[PDB]
Amino acid sequence: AISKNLPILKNHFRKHWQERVKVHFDQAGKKVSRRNARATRAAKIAPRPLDLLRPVVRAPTVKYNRKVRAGRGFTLAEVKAAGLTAAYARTIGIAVDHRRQNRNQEIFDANVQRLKEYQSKIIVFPRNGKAPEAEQVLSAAATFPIAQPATDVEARAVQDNGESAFRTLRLARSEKKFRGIREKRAREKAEAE
Amino acid sequence: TVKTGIAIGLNKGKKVTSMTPAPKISYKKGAASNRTKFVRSLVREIAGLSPYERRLIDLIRNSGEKRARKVAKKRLGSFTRAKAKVEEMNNIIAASR
Amino acid sequence: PSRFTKTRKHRGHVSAGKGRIGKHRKHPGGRGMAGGQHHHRINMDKYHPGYFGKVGMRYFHKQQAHFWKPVLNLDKLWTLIPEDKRDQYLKSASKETAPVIDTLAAGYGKILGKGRIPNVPVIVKARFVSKLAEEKIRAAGGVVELIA
RNA sequence: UUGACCUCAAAUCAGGUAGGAGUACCCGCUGAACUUAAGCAUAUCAAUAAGCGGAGGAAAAGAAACCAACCGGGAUUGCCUUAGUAACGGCGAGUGAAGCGGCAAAAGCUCAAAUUUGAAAUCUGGUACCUUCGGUGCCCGAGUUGUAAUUUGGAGAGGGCAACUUUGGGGCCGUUCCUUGUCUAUGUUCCUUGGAACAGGACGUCAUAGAGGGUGAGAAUCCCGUGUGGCGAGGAGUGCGGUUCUUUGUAAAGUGCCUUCGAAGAGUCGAGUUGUUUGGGAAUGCAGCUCUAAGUGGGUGGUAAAUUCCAUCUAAAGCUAAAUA
RNA sequence: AAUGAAAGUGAACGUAGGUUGGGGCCUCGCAAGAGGUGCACAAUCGACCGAUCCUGAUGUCUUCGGAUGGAUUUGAGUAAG
RNA sequence: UUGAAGACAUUGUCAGGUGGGGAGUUUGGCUGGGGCGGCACAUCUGUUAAACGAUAACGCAGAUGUCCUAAGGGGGGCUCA
Ligand SMILES: [K+]
Ligand SMILES: [K+]
Ligand SMILES: [K+]
Ligand SMILES: [K+]
Ligand SMILES: [K+]
Ligand SMILES: [K+]
Ligand SMILES: [K+]
Ligand SMILES: [K+]
Ligand SMILES: [K+]
Ligand SMILES: [K+]
Ligand SMILES: [Mg+2]
Ligand SMILES: [Mg+2]
Ligand SMILES: [Mg+2]
Ligand SMILES: [Mg+2]
Ligand SMILES: [Mg+2]
Ligand SMILES: [Mg+2]
Ligand SMILES: [Mg+2]
Ligand SMILES: [Mg+2]
Ligand SMILES: [Mg+2]
Ligand SMILES: [Mg+2]
Ligand SMILES: [Mg+2]
Ligand SMILES: [Mg+2]
Ligand SMILES: [Mg+2]
Ligand SMILES: [Mg+2]
Ligand SMILES: [Mg+2]
Ligand SMILES: [Mg+2]
Ligand SMILES: [Mg+2]
Ligand SMILES: [Mg+2]
Ligand SMILES: [Mg+2]
Ligand SMILES: [Mg+2]
Ligand SMILES: [Mg+2]
Ligand SMILES: [Mg+2]
Ligand SMILES: [Mg+2]
Ligand SMILES: [Mg+2]
Ligand SMILES: [Mg+2]
Question: Does C127 touch chain B (CB under 8 A)?
């Protein structure tokens, strides 16, 4: 069972795997159903859009923190800053999230902007009569798209202070590596008095 | 903190304009109220000490806090809990005198 | 498809191409990687040296995102300016309006130094840089701005 | 002696409820060996088959004692990825997840711990009446060893001050949704063969209908249907569009400022040890036994320990559509 | 984009090198040839990146930093994809 | 209710012993069949071996699992049966 110059393989089929094969023949059918359900939901809910308004947030980790994306819901602070209560906002198509905190003014200010633009571009019918024919827009996400913020300009003046980014990186790496030993030395020194 | 704006070293990371969010009341979980302070005092008076606590007060009296902590650790599991427990028994000893 | 297989051409030849003497039996040799230190040692030593035994240190709960640092050589670099704007910036080589190249936005974590850039100042934003990459950018009148 | 109370009984007492079936999928328990390792015991097959208990149209899970270490994300589930990877492993054979990212679907919340104390404000039953999936009187009873209102950590409560905003519940008629009924084109014209024309040839016709089936052989045009559109009947349900009756408001809710407070689940958590299990490695989860906490506490932060910080949630109580099977 | 167990570091001395071959093309020859240029590919000597072992400059949280230069060492590398 | 018994015993969890009563499994190879014997199973010298190298048999005659701070290294003087 080993022979020739071939890769070593790792095909995990030593259990009763044929009992649990899922072939997705319903791919096309599930797509028609999903679409019918969007249509059915849209009719039941009309003229409301099929989605709640969602905030912008920074993705976590060094790998994706360069991006912004839609988050779960607005903070209580952002909703208050936009001149709104959480209880009301939930009923007017805004997702609210009690867990997320604001620790960054840029993302906070941008989210407050989203809520203001939204309250401008909706019409809440009164809870009695009069109800004017509005016409249904299905996507809040398409109406209020998430823009990636701009970092810099296209071009500008070169400013060289002669420091060396490479040396800056090495020194920073070293300062971290010896912080602790250098604290111990500047205790064991200062103690003996 | 204040991040340095580079990708390594002590306070690595992007500098952004900070906010300071309002304190979540959940963070005061198990802070002593006046009600619980009072009830806990009363029930100690009624109920008194458990056998291991009595062994601990005797051991502080004779063999000192070092040996007490060693026993409290065995009895409670943690050293953090044993330190706290021997502290509590020191205050019971000090209140009687 | 079945019509082009040798199964079709073996129809009528007794042994189906597996021999009269040796035959096609079930698992002579054992299943899978059986015998790697015994009767399959020669294969393993010849084509997979290093297969048995341990080297190096374990790391529990390793998250690959921690190690994300895709590399870009200077060779490329000008590829990050769009092709429309590239030709103007190359002919108008100016310390006053050097293009900014955000290499993180482009999806890179470190500028390495392979090859040669045009003698045209550029501002390069990066998380990391090699020593030689920095020298080559500065020798073209550029700068490396470190970012996070 | 008479009457309570507590606890425990009896009745063919009044009214109910469980069992058994099915069992594809779902929630648990219990639990193999064949097999692989070219032998075999750990391992693998498999946390599978068989056995047992329990559900529904879905179940389960679920609004963080979460992930992280970022410029941070934000209930659960599922798909694409992560990845045949980190890790486990007679480090052999073999095994093997998670975080982030893209998507489908999206929905949030409830108790306990509080003096109504100027009024147990609460609720089952019986009984009479009524407009009966229920309502109103009246009467026993339950209940202070605590039933309502009020609050659930995102908070919130008690005082004090100042302001403006917003509301309920019926029928009736359309639409909706399901179940049904009915009506809605055009050759059976001639010749040949044949028992039979639905075959061949000729000349037409309808076509939003030339799907399919039947009829004495290959039939759009003989019949039923098909296509298009119309007209009925019967429910279900306010989902929501109109109309009509009653306007709940001395009520209810929301909001700013000041001030005093801020109750938050124990034989649990955690620890040791034993067994089992996991990719989880000085111990991933589960369980037995022993030990057994705290309140600026407690849990987690994937290498044991002490010391010092920091970050992040808020366990030991509970409900919840959809995407999935 | 490699390399290293890892922290990490990370690919032009030069016409992206020299030498020997090398199809085809170019020039001169009636032609034989002679000369030039030589892609792929082959052999060989170098250079470059990482590991290992040495060396240890200017500097300086006086123990950090690690220039420069080496080595019968090593890599599943670079050297117009 | 009446005797006994009494914080002992019993029961629970862990620990040491005992435990073919029972469970699971194993119990090399070569070989003039197999077994007994031997090792021709890792090896070394001479021969077989056919004057390069290779070369079989449970062919022939033997050896190995050690021994040595000198019995290793260098130099000097000397010469053995
Ligand atoms: K063959
Ligand atoms: K009954
Ligand atoms: K697992
Ligand atoms: K365990
Ligand atoms: K957070
Ligand atoms: K903490
Ligand atoms: K006893
Ligand atoms: K025993
Ligand atoms: K036995
Ligand atoms: K024999
Ligand atoms: Mg043949
Ligand atoms: Mg055969
Ligand atoms: Mg074979
Ligand atoms: Mg009865
Ligand atoms: Mg099988
Ligand atoms: Mg086997
Ligand atoms: Mg076998
Ligand atoms: Mg066997
Ligand atoms: Mg079964
Ligand atoms: Mg059912
Ligand atoms: Mg469903
Ligand atoms: Mg459920
Ligand atoms: Mg909560
Ligand atoms: Mg989540
Ligand atoms: Mg891959
Ligand atoms: Mg497994
Ligand atoms: Mg209220
Ligand atoms: Mg027919
Ligand atoms: Mg089990
Ligand atoms: Mg539930
Ligand atoms: Mg036996
Ligand atoms: Mg034999
Ligand atoms: Mg051999
Ligand atoms: Mg010879
Ligand atoms: Mg000698």
Answer: yes
